[PDB]
Amino acid sequence: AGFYVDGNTLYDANGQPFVMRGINHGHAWYKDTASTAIPAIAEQGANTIRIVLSDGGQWEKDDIDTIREVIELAEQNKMVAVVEVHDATGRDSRSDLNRAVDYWIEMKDALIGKEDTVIINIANEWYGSWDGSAWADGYIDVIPKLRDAGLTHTLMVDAAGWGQYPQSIHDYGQDVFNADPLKNTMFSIHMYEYAGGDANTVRSNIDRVIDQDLALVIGEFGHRHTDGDVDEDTILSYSEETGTGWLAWSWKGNSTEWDYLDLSEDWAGQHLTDWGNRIVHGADGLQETSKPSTVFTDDNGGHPEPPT
Numbered sequence: 001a002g003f004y005v006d007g008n009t010l011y012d013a014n015g016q017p018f019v020m021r022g023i024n025h026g027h028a029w030y031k032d033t034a035s036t037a038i039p040a041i042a043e044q045g046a047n048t049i050r051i052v053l054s055d056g057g058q059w060e061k062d063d064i065d066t067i068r069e070v071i072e073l074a075e076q077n078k079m080v081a082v083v084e085v086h087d088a089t090g091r092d093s094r095s096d097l098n099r100a101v102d103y104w105i106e107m108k109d110a111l112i113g114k115e116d117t118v119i120i121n122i123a124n125e126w127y128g129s130w131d132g133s134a135w136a137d138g139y140i141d142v143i144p145k146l147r148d149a150g151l152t153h154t155l156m157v158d159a160a161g162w163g164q165y166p167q168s169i170h171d172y173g174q175d176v177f178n179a180d181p182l183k184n185t186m187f188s189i190h191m192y193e194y195a196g197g198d199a200n201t202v203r204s205n206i207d208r209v210i211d212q213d214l215a216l217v218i219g220e221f222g223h224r225h226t227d228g229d230v231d232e233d234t235i236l237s238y239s240e241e242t243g244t245g246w247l248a249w250s251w252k253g254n255s256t257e258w259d260y261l262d263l264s265e266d267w268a269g270q271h272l273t274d275w276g277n278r279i280v281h282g283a284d285g286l287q288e289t290s291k292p293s294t295v296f297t298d299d300n301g302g303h304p305e306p307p308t
């Protein structure tokens with residue numbers, strides 16, 4: 001137990017398809033907020049929270065006791081935790097990837113035993129360049145190291161191109177998957193203006209992964225704003241049509257010029273923004289479509305208990 005991937009479907013530990021419907025939380029930048037943000041996100045109906053961690057590369061490192069704390073908060077609030085290291089974002093450097101891999105191995109004791117509730121997203125947006133082969137080489141190399149260190153979680157691998165070059169997955173995703181000796185790896189696309197700018201683009205980018213029988217989440221995405229087009233309506237409707245997961249960016253704490261992407265005015269989620277209301281209450285949003293992982297209800301799938 002726990003998560004596993006078969007074709008384009010992610011299954012929870014009870015064999016039930018699990019379609020992520022949730023929210024990114026920039027924990028690494030606002031470490032003290034966990035015990036507030038995590039329940040608030042759960043209160044919006046998210047079944048999954050993606051937790052931004054730092055290995056010390058660009059921000060303050062999240063230590064092993066912090067990792068245990070956020071996992072426990074996610075579990076207590078009945079959300080799947082997608083944990084991710086954010087410091088190699090946009091880096092081609094294998095060294096920067098290796099620091100993220102070493103971090104997961106370092107923190108393994110916080111992760112082993114939580115394979116039914118935690119999914120490891122190896123590195124946010126590793127490999128900034130617009131190609132697939134060198135991106136694939138990185139994961140082919142490091143995935144076996146994660147396995148041999150004893151991590152049996154479903155692994156999640158971001159597309160190249162800062163998450164916006166999904167052709168990387170279309171072309172080399174199978175090669176990456178095949179290098180996992182546990183055959184338990186899924187992929188993620190980040191849909192902003194390059195990978196999610198219109199309906200056609202959203203649908204083609206999804207199809208090019210899932211039609212390869214590879215499992216997918218839209219692990220970050222935004223929305224249309226003055227500066228730019230992102231088609232959040234098609235991300236939500238087409239994800240619901242296809243059983244593709246998605247995780248909106250982000251609960252709170254964007255820089256000033258990107259604060260149109262904050263879902264909530266407050267850490268405690270009492271005052272959603274227009275964007276928050278679209279994600280939570282709007283068409284195909286969390287309230288309409290999010291179902292909890294069945295691991296969080298311990299009823300043994302309706303088994304009748306013997307009479308006493």
Ligand code: NA
Binds near residue numbers: 307308
């Ligand atoms: Na009895």
